[PDB]
Structures are given as structure tokens and as C-alpha cells.
RNA sequence: CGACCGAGUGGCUUGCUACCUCGAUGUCGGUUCCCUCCAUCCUGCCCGUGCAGAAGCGGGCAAGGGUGAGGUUGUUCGCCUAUUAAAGGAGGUCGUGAGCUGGGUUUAGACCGUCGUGAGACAGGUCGGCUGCUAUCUACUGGGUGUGUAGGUGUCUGACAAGAACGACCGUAUAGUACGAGAGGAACUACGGUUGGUGGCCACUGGUGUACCGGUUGUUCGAGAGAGCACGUGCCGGGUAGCCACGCCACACGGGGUAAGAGCUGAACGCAUCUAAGCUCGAAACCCACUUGGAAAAGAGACACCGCCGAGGUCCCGCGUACAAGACGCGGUCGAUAGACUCGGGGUGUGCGCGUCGAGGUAACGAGACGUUAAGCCCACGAGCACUAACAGACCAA
RNA sequence: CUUGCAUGAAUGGAUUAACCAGAGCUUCACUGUCCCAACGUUGGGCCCGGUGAACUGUACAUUCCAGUGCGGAGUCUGGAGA
RNA sequence: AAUUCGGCAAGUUAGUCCCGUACCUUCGGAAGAAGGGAUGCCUGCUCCGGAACGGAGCAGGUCGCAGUGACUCGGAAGCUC
């Protein structure tokens, strides 16, 4: 993929449950895999910001819930770095549901998002309120 | 730059930017000063903040 | 199934093994280029802190922008080349041939050498040319120390005497560029080796840390769960099968980490300069304070302060030189806190 | 794609045999850690196609590297999910219990079903049910003391030895291009990043920090002040140095020779023919390059200087860039090596005492508030500084 | 649901509030069980003075790679290394 | 809880007072179900009682990140055998 432009140390993990930062119907969503990832022997497979994961819906309406989807982080509350040295850390960690464009499914934001993730994902950036 | 804490002057290259849930932006110089916020402590009670003094 | 699983450790850098010379030998030097010269220089790790740049890479989607950057701090005061060594061709490999010195020595040279009292800096130089009209000539190399009394912050006056190798144009001129370097005292500089933004390898003897286990050593696992309460926290499964019969060298075990030679490749130059403009309030952790002639390493240096450090012009170089990147601050904040 | 029939290779399954052990070679499955095989799953390079392209299908060379995480089940096996370049198989006493685990098989207790007159049985199920030992030898990982080479100091050489020190992926430009009715849709090359592996480092972020400073509960020292105990910090808050990873730095290209394969010249055989002689190319694979070790390499090495009555060294003394003993490195008055003192640079968070205020209370009394006071207390770092201690001095040696 | 290889009525059948260091499963909360390990504390370990056992011992023994042999060798055979 | 046969080991909760409390049930129980709030010190007081160096409350003031401040001190709910 396009370069981040920072670093980042993964908060999470298959397995984690976050936070749908949108208002697709879904408010809890549970990391399955990571996109493009293969890690090494035991190693519990990790994913952050910027990184495209595939998720299953915890919480949220009916029709919603159990339903294998996409999804990009948002925030994450384990720190990043940017090139100024800088570090930049969140309230929680969360997640916006995408489909197969990259497109988000929603049709608005929750909360604020990271400027790295309009490098990667411009359509979901460009439905941000706030991009810190 | 400055602390949104204390108020001394954030070393170049240094500190870290926490976002807020509503998307507000606090940049702390040091991790004392982090600490110190999240017992709910405010900057200018405290004597050895510039802020403070 | 049992998943697959690469070894713990390398077996590239062994035997792991306290090291000979505590001052590092190059095995390896640059090809011969452009004009004769030294290829390499020699100083003492004095501590980290950290700088801001502005982007130089013109493939970066950055370049132009500020940029923070750490950095190693390292004095570099000059040196002084007391001899050439030349080296003759033989069906054994390369051979000693003879040495050329000088009388101009520093007042202290004699705290590791027998000085020369009596010397015949002709009878030698004949000997190097007589060879080479035969055509027998290996390669020419200067005996080179350095002036431990010129940086305080280290305690050792007793110099570090170390063979650095000369390359060049022809084998005459650079033979002649010897001679002239040697003769007049030997003193040169970190400025006539090398330039702000050229990319070298720093080689020097790790940090030392006497005996050490397999989880450090090696990086393998710790028992886990049930395993690691039952009398085995940080010990390997086992030495080998039943057959062979034997335990092999590969498998992990503990002993002497640290305290070895290594060559980092590729470190960047940052800047070379003089005064204490690098120095931190209260003084390097430590080391002390810096105020003389130095150098800006980008990145880690293999070894703890004071230890002395070698240069050789990147022998293997991913990327071009991009010369006297524009600094734009210099952290001076203490290191304490 | 491929029946029938025919010829084989392996030694993973199963069966047969009864050679080895019954004065015992500890079970299955798992785990950890090391080496290997090729009948190749991916990755490199190739050939054919019912090969437009793109995606395939089949085949050749090839074992460098990789081949991961989870849900049921003791399971091996196998079924299932989401990822992936791919999530290959097999050997090492079905590798591995003087390494671990103990869920299953297979002790003694008990229940159910079937069988039995009954004790009891079952190649049926089920709950419970123990893991001994101070390493003599050999083997390897690291550390020393001697002898050989036959005075010492410093600098090297390089027979050999180890390496995966690097593997792989995504994205951008190429390009919505070549190809194609359209749908769809590449490549050489150049860049940016990710992942797995590897070596080192701590300016930055993070952890620790029973150094330190502060708050506060119970109790004892009459109160106050200042202190002890409460597991080897009573608890709570902050945390320097150092050590660390979750932090940060670095890890080719290119040559040489080949395999499969593509060809040149070319004969036996006037022609043809990549081959028989000769030659040009061509694999992540081989060799070099690079990193690490390496004068005990018995052909036991080379150079320069000092010295053979004196060069150099051990002991001693103050210390660590070093350290389990030993070893290693530095300084020793021709001195800043350690300590005291003073600065500087840091950690806490405003000392005791006094003064004013203070809800009230006749008063006594009074929790607490402001000031004095960036105060008081503290430091594993640096500088200054010979005040103190590196003194006296012993020994070996051509 | 059920055709029960081979359930069934004091060889007791069905069932059940309360009780349980009894067997199985699920959720919230919690966490170094794990990802993936780090630093620290106390007692040992290591060096020194004193005290001072036992297990085991046909012999020889610096081994490695293969082979052979009653088919699972430090000792036989050929090499290698030392 | 991704660990493992299995949350084994460790942890979490906790004292007291007020509010409040499901299915089921042999009507006893379930039940501390669950869930929510309070908690120190200083000042002056009210009520019960003969009184306590007994107990229950009120008003005002006031410090800390934290008032069962250490210690002492349950983790909770559901299904089946
Ligand atoms: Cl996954
Ligand atoms: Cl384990
Ligand atoms: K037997
Ligand atoms: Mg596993
Ligand atoms: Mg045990
Ligand atoms: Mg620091
Ligand atoms: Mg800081
Ligand atoms: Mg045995
Ligand atoms: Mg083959
Ligand atoms: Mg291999
Ligand atoms: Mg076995
Ligand atoms: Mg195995
Ligand atoms: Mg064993
Ligand atoms: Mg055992
Ligand atoms: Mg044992
Ligand atoms: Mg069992
Ligand atoms: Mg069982
Ligand atoms: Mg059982
Ligand atoms: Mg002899
Ligand atoms: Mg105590
Ligand atoms: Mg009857
Ligand atoms: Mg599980
Ligand atoms: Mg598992
Ligand atoms: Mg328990
Ligand atoms: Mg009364
Ligand atoms: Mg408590
Ligand atoms: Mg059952
Ligand atoms: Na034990
Ligand atoms: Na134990
Ligand atoms: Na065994
Ligand atoms: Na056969
Ligand atoms: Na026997
Ligand atoms: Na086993
Ligand atoms: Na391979
Ligand atoms: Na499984
Ligand atoms: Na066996
Ligand atoms: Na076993
Ligand atoms: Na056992
Ligand atoms: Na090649
Ligand atoms: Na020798
Ligand atoms: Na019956
Ligand atoms: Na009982
Ligand atoms: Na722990």
C-alpha cells in the first residue's frame, strides 16, 4: 500500500473489540484478520491504524449484527509517531465499516479521525468531521 | 510550542498530542504533566506549574 | 503438525566469543577510485541526542520539510599517520614487506610502543619501489594512532594504534601521497577523509554483558503457561534428538554476550565540525562535555562511551551522497529526565 | 483425462515373521529446541496449451528461504472460519519425560448397558485416580592455566571455519496503455512503504526503578517536632541514572561457472542436425563479493622497533569502557583514577517556626487557609578543585 | 425429533425447590494464561575460612562419520579429527 | 483467555448503612439474588437510656488522586447431568 507517513506500534489484535465509528447501524465490531498480514509462529496476528481489517458485528441493530465485514481503524489509544518526532495517541480505538472500493458504508463519521488515514483512504476521509 | 499543561516550552523533537473524544487537541511536554492531569488536577493549583506562577 | 519456525539467532556472528582487540579491525576496505588517500579515521563515543533536517531525499514525498533525526555523538580529534606499511605479493597470500617511519612523535606514543631510536627511512622506501618495479607490490597501508590526551572526557593517555589501508589513483601516486603524509608528522583530520552527508561504516566492540542465557543470547521463548511454573522458567526443551548422539554447536546455549566485534554498514554522516555546539546541559551521562572536533553519526554506534570507534568509507552503499544536509537545530537539552 | 494388462522404486500405513531386550531401551497426543530428505505447496528460471489478453491447466530444472492464527475433539487424522505468496509432505528409537505436560490407553473406588446361576467379564461408555536421582565419562556452549613453535613491544597475514544475513509482499508512475468486438486488462524499468528474519543502540515514546520526594490509615515513643513496625515498600501519587521493547539505527548491486531451457558454428551421413570436438546465453539454487572466528596452519607464519644487565613483565596502589573464579582495560604526583567540598545538570512539589485568617465556642479550644517559600529534602551524572587516598615498595627477566 | 446395536417402572420409572471443595457448557467483570517479554525485591547460586557425607565403579577410555556384528558399537573394519 | 484437555495459576469483588431485588419453589426459601447511592476530619448540637470511656441522627466548616484510605474484608448471572 501508499506509505503511512508514521509509525506505528498495533494496538490491536484478532480477537479485539472496537468501536464503529459511523452510523451504518453497527456500534461494536470484533478484528477477525488484517489485510495483507502473515505473521510467525504463535504470534497473536496484529492490526492498527491505517491498516485494513475484516471485522463481525458484536453490537448494533439486527440486520447488522453477525454479518462478516470490512472495515479501516481510525483511532487507536497505543501511541504513533510522526516525523517531528511527535507522538499522538486517542481516546479509544475504532474502526469505520468499508466495502469493496474502499468506500465507506455509512453515511457519516463518529468522532474525530487521523490525518494519515486521508493518505490511504480519501473517500472515507472525505466524510471526516474532524481530522486531527 | 508550549504545554497545554504546564506552560514551559515543549523541547523540540519531544511530548505527545492526546486527542480527545470530541476531537480537542492537548499537547503535554512531559508524561509528570500527563499524570498529574489525569488525577483531575488543574495546572494552576499547582506551585510548580508556570502556568501557576 | 507443529507450524514451521525460523532458528533463534544467526550463526554468522561467532564464535560468540569475548573479542581479541578491544580497538576493531576492518577485514574488508573501499575499491580504488578517484585520488589516493587514507580510508579511514578513528574517535570516541561520547553520547546521543537529537537534530532537525530538512528532508533531502528528492524521492520523498517530504523532501523540503523539517525532519527530526537522532544522533550519535562522537569525537573526532585528529590523528596521526606514523608509518607506511607495504605488502608483497606471494603464493601464500599478502606478506609484510617492510615499514617507513618517521621522528616526529607524540609525547606520549611510548606508553604502548618502543618508540624508533634508530631507523632508515630510505633503505626501506628503496626496498617498496625495488618491488614494485618487479611488479611484486601488494598494497599500501599507514600505521595510524590516535590522541587519547586531547579528549578529557576520556582517562586513557595511552594511544590506539591501529593499520588503515591507502587507495587510490596509480600505485606510484598513491605510494608518493604515503610518503608525504608520513613525513611531515602524520597529523591529519576527519576533514580530509570524509565530508557532511557521504555514508560510512562504523565498526567498533559491543557493550559488554559477561554471561548471559539462551533467552537473551539467542532469543528463544520462556516456558509458557503451565510449563513455566513447574521448576523451568528460562531453559530450551532440549539439547538435540536421541540420534545423533551428540549435541550440536547450533543448538542455543548460554555464555559470553556482548564484548564483540561488529560493522554496522551504511551509517550517514550528519555533520563534522568543532567547538560545543552538540554538547548537553549537565553534561553526557557518563562521558562528559564535548568541545573540540566531532562528528554527528545518524542512528546507534555498536559500544558504550568512550570507546573508540573506526570509519571506512562505505564499502557497500544503497544510496547516492547527498552532500551538507541543512541542520536546522541541535538538541542541547539535558539527558537527565 | 486416461481403463486393461505388464515392469518397477520407496520403507510413511497395514499385515506376516519371532532375529535382538522380559536381573525393564518409560506410553499416545501435545510442547519446546536442533539437523536432514525431495516424490516442490509458495517464491526464481523454463517448456506445452483446447496459449488474444487477464486468470488458468499440465510439465521441466530447483531443497536458498518460507509454509502462519483460530472454533469442536485428548486426539494423530480430519471437518470448519477468516487471513496468505503459499498457508507441501516426510526422516531423525513413529527425534525429543536424567526437558515439560498428563487430556487418552491401561492398576486399585464407583455407575450404566450387554453377557453370565455366580465370582466376574467386555478390543462398550462414564466420573476419580502419583511423574524418583547431588553428572564419573563422553558431547557441545562460553571462561582460564600450562607446554610446543624457540628476550620483548606494537601492527598484520590467512590455511581453513560459520552465515539466510537476508527472504517475501503491497502500492505509485508505466497505464486504463499493449492485447481485445466488448467485458476485461498486463510487462521491462524506476521509485515509496509493509511483513518475517538478523545484528546493534537508548536522543525520542514506553516499562521498571523495595535510589529518592510527597499524601494518608492503625499503633508505640506524653503532645508537637521527628521517627519505628504493618514481608522483607502499610497503602496511595510522582519518578532520576542504568537495564530494556512496545522505542530507534543498519542488513546490495555486481561479477564467474552451470541446471532445465533458448541458440550459434558443425560432422559422422555431400543434405539436415543446439553436440559428437568447439562456442554464445541462461535459475531465489553453486562460487566470489560482505560479516564473524582464526599462528597449535607440526611447512607451528610475516614486518618494524626496543632490548640480551637489562627492554619488557608480574606483584602492590586508586579504579572500571571489563567481569561467576581466572581473564580484560585504565590511572598512579611527568597525576584529575576515587572520595570530600562548591558549582552545574536532575527528582519531588512549597519545610520547621512565626504572623494573619478560620466554621464556631464565655473561654479554653480549633480541622484547615495565605505568607514567609520555585521552598524544604534528595541524586547511581558532569565540571571545578590535589584538601584526602593512588603511599612504601617486592619480584621475574634473554 | 428419535425405528431404543442393547431404555422402563422399589434389579424402581419419571421428576424436583433447597444443598455441594461432585461432571459438562454459556455471559458480564478481571487479569502477564497468551501476544512477548522487561526491570526490580528477598533467599541460594559464584569466590573465601571451618565442617564434611552418599549414589556409582569388569577393564580400557580425546571422539566423529559410515560400515560390520545376535538385526540398536567410545573399544571390531575403513576413513576423518585429536 | 487469542493461552490450555480445562481460566490450571494469578487476579477481580469485599467492612457498614440506605434504596432496591428476577425465574423457580416443598411457601421455609431463592436472597448479601441482581443493580444503585453513602462512608474522613474539624465545630456546635438533638434523640433513646439511669448511665457508659454505649447507640442513632442534625447543622456548618474543611483536606486528599483515593476517607471499610493500612489491616480486616463475596466476584456475579444462566443452562444441563
Ligand atoms: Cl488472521
Ligand atoms: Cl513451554
Ligand atoms: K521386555
Ligand atoms: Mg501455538
Ligand atoms: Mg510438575
Ligand atoms: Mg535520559
Ligand atoms: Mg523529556
Ligand atoms: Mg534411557
Ligand atoms: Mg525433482
Ligand atoms: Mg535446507
Ligand atoms: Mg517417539
Ligand atoms: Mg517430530
Ligand atoms: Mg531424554
Ligand atoms: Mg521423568
Ligand atoms: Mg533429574
Ligand atoms: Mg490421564
Ligand atoms: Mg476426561
Ligand atoms: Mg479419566
Ligand atoms: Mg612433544
Ligand atoms: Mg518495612
Ligand atoms: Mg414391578
Ligand atoms: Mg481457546
Ligand atoms: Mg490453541
Ligand atoms: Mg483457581
Ligand atoms: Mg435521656
Ligand atoms: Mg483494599
Ligand atoms: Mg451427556
Ligand atoms: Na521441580
Ligand atoms: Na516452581
Ligand atoms: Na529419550
Ligand atoms: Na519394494
Ligand atoms: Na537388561
Ligand atoms: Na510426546
Ligand atoms: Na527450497
Ligand atoms: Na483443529
Ligand atoms: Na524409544
Ligand atoms: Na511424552
Ligand atoms: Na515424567
Ligand atoms: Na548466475
Ligand atoms: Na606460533
Ligand atoms: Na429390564
Ligand atoms: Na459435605
Ligand atoms: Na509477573
Known amino acids: 500500500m501508499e506509505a503511512l507517513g508514521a509509525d506505528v506500534t498495533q494496538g490491536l489484535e484478532k480477537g479485539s473489540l472496537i468501536t464503529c465509528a459511523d452510523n451504518t447501524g453497527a456500534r461494536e465490531l470484533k478484528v477477525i484478520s488484517v489485510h495483507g498480514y502473515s505473521g510467525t509462529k504463535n504470534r497473536l496476528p496484529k492490526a492498527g491504524l491505517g491498516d485494513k481489517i475484516t471485522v463481525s458485528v458484536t453490537k448494533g441493530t439486527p440486520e447488522m449484527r453477525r454479518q462478516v465485514l470490512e472495515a479501516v481503524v481510525v483511532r487507536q489509544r497505543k501511541p504513533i509517531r510522526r516525523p517531528d518526532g511527535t507522538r499522538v495517541k486517542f481516546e479509544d480505538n475504532a474502526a469505520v465499516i468499508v466495502d469493496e472500493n474502499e468506500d465507506p458504508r455509512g453515511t457519516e463519521l463518529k468522532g474525530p479521525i487521523a490525518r494519515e488515514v486521508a493518505q490511504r483512504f480519501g473517500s472515507v476521509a472525505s466524510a471526516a468531521t474532524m481530522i486531527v | 510550542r508550549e504545554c497545554d499543561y504546564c506552560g514551559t516550552d515543549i523541547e523540540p523533537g519531544t511530548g505527545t498530542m492526546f486527542v480527545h473524544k470530541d476531537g480537542a487537541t492537548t499537547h503535554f511536554c512531559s508524561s509528570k504533566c500527563e499524570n498529574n492531569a489525569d488525577l483531575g488536577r488543574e495546572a494552576r493549583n499547582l506551585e510548580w506549574t508556570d502556568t501557576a506562577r | 503438525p507443529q507450524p514451521s519456525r525460523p532458528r533463534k539467532g544467526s550463526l554468522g556472528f561467532g564464535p560468540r566469543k569475548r573479542s581479541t582487540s578491544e580497538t576493531p579491525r576492518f577485514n574488508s576496505w573501499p575499491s580504488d577510485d578517484g585520488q589516493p ?38 569525537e573526532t580529534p585528529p590523528m596521526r599517520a606514523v608509518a607506511l606499511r607495504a605488502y608483497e605479493d606471494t603464493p601464500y597470500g599478502q606478506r609484510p614487506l617492510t615499514e617507513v617511519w618517521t621522528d616526529e612523535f607524540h609525547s606520549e606514543l611510548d606508553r604502548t610502543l618502543d618508540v624508533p631510536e634508530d631507523h632508515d627511512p630510505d633503505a626501506a622506501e628503496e626496498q617498496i ?82 554471561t548471559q542465557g539462551p533467552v537473551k543470547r539467542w532469543g528463544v521463548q520462556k ?77 546507534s554506534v555498536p559500544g558504550p562511551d568512550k570507546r573508540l570507534v573506526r570509519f571506512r568509507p562505505a564499502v557497500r552503499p544503497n544510496d547516492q551522497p547527498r552532500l551538507d544536509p541543512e541542520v536546522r537545530y541541535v538538541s542541547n537539552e539535558s539527558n537527565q529526565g
Not at chain 3, 190 to 206: H, K, L, P, S
Not at chain 3, 242 to 268: A, D, F, I, M
Not at chain 3, 277 to 295: I, L, R
Request: net charge negative.
Open chain 3, 37 to 74: 588517500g587514507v580510508q579511514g579515521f578513528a574517535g570516541y563515543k561520547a553520547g546521543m541526542t537529537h537534530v532537525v533536517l530538512v528532508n533531502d531525499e528528492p524521492n520523498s514525498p517530504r523532501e523540503g520539510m523539517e525532519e527530526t533525526v537522532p544522533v550519535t555523538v562522537i
Open chain 3, 129 to 210: 619501489r625495488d618491488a614494485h618495479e618487479a611488479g611484486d607490490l601488494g598494497d599500501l597501508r599507514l600505521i595510524t594512532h590516535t590522541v587519547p590526551d586531547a579528549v578529557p572526557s576520556v582517562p586513557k593517555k595511552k594511544p590506539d594504534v591501529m593499520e588503515t589501508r591507502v587507495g587510490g589513483g596509480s600505485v606510484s601516486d598513491r605510494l608518493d601521497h604515503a610518503l608525504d603524509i608520513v613525513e611531515d608528522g602524520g597529523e591529519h583530520a576527519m576533514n580530509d577523509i570524509f565530508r557532511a552527508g557521504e555514508y560510512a561504516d562504523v565498526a567498533g566492540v559491543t557493550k559488554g554483558k559477561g
Open chain 3, 223 to 299: 516456558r509458557k503457561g503451565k510449563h513455566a511454573r513447574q521448576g523451568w522458567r528460562r531453559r530450551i526443551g532440549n539439547l538435540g534428538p536421541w540420534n545423533p548422539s551428540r549435541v550440536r554447536s547450533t543448538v542455543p546455549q548460554q555464555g559470553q554476550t556482548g564484548y564483540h566485534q561488529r560493522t554496522e554498514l551504511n551509517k550517514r554522516l550528519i555533520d563534522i565540525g568543532e567547538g560545543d555546539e552538540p554538547t548537553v546541559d549537565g553534561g553526557f551521562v557518563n562521558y562528559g562535555e564535548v568541545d573540540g572536533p566531532y562528528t554527528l553519526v545518524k542512528g
